[PDB]
Amino acid sequence: FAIMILVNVFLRPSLMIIGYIAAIALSYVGVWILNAGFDHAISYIQ
Amino acid sequence: DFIAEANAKGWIMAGSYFFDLVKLNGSATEDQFDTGTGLDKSSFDPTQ
């Protein structure tokens, strides 16, 4: 019962940083994905 | 004409073509009066 928790609390901060900067990238491309097709998904609707 | 362009874009952006596809598959299963003359804007006031 000590194993799974002990590694968790050991790795939780580092992994959080792993998911921070990486996520900062993803959200970036997020907007671009939208801008890749929004004007075409709104084409007939406008 | 979108088909080839979609081939240029790939698979992620297939969603934005939806109403084009509906514009197509549906087409696979498928008295005149002047409007906007602007004569309504005309006015006639006798009190002048």
In angstroms, the separation between the Cα of residue A18 and the nearest Cα of chain B is 25
Distance separating alpha carbons of residues B9 and A7, to the nearest angstrom: 43
Residue of A nearest to B12 (CA): A33
- The tokens for B29 are 């299963």
Q: How far apart are CA A40 and CA A33, in angstroms?
A: 12
Task: Name the token pair of B19.
Answer: 């109403």
- Half-sphere exposure of residue B38: CA atoms within 13 angstroms, side-chain side: 0
Q: Find out whether B13 and A36 touch, Cβ atoms under 8 Å.
A: yes
Nearest CA-CA distance, residue A36 and chain B, Å: 8
- Nearest Cα residue to A35 out of B13, B5, B35: B13
Chain A residues with beta carbon closer than 8 angstroms to that of B18: 41
